[PDB]
Design a protein around this ligand. Sequence first.
Ligand SMILES: O=P(O)(O)O[C@@H]1[C@@H](OP(=O)(O)O)[C@@H](OP(=O)(O)O)[C@@H](O)[C@H](OP(=O)(O)O)[C@H]1OP(=O)(O)O
Ligand SMILES: Nc1ncnc2c1ncn2[C@@H]1O[C@H](COP(=O)(O)OP(=O)(O)O)[C@@H](O)[C@H]1O
Ligand SMILES: [Mg+2]
Length: 217
Amino acid sequence: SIRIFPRIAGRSYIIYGQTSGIICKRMEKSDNEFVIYNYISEHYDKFLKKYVPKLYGKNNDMLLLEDLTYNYNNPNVMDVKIGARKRKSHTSGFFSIRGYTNSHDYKFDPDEYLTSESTINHIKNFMEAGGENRDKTKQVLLKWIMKLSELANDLFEINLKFDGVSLIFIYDDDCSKCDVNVVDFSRVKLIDTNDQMTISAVTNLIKILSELADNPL
Ligand SMILES: O=P(O)(O)O[C@@H]1[C@@H](OP(=O)(O)O)[C@@H](OP(=O)(O)O)[C@@H](O)[C@H](OP(=O)(O)O)[C@H]1OP(=O)(O)O
Ligand SMILES: Nc1ncnc2c1ncn2[C@@H]1O[C@H](COP(=O)(O)OP(=O)(O)O)[C@@H](O)[C@H]1O
Ligand SMILES: [Mg+2]
């Protein structure tokens, strides 16, 4: 019995693993994603441990990846592309929200270019599922800011172009647990400097989330 994994975005074949806590992702165009996990493992092991789901193995053209939603009763997931898009410019300036849990209920369209005001409204839409205890939703926002802060810092010292990578924001309905990790290395490339487009995406999100944690309404 093959069980299809409930993606929030993208074109890739992702099924639940035969086993608890794993998803399998088909590398469709090349094994570049595998080359890149293994390169980050050699040269930036600390970055891998803190910010990337664990790669457990490869089976032909499938990566056996840590399921980021596994320890969640009621996960809310949001995919934000922070790396360069292939051709298009970003739908929210420095980044592109690709989807989120219940996005359909707020007539979210991934092809729509958004104002600052609309971008913030879509992130606020993503947080509705967390209920109205604004104390525990601030805690979710702050714990995301804590890890994005460190990621923006660490990214200055990493000589990769993160073309096409996303942040996966997760929080539980009861707001008791949350996390953000970096995924989708299939178009990442080696370069001789750091990636300022990707750092500006993260710093922008940190700005947006800070505004929400401080906003007193
Ligand atoms: O966002 P870019 O421009 O890079 O390409 C995107 C592409 O978007 P498009 O070429 O703008 O239509 C997406 O197609 P849909 O939006 O699902 O129709 C695709 O599904 C990957 O989007 P996701 O990363 O959201 O899947 C891909 O990205 P990649 O993995 O870099 O080939
Ligand atoms: N390790 C993971 N744990 C949980 N969900 C994941 C994981 N990796 C990817 N996903 C889900 O799959 C979607 C797309 O994955 P991604 O790596 O961006 O692949 P693609 O190359 O198809 O865009 C994300 O929006 C997310 O919901
Ligand atoms: Mg992707």
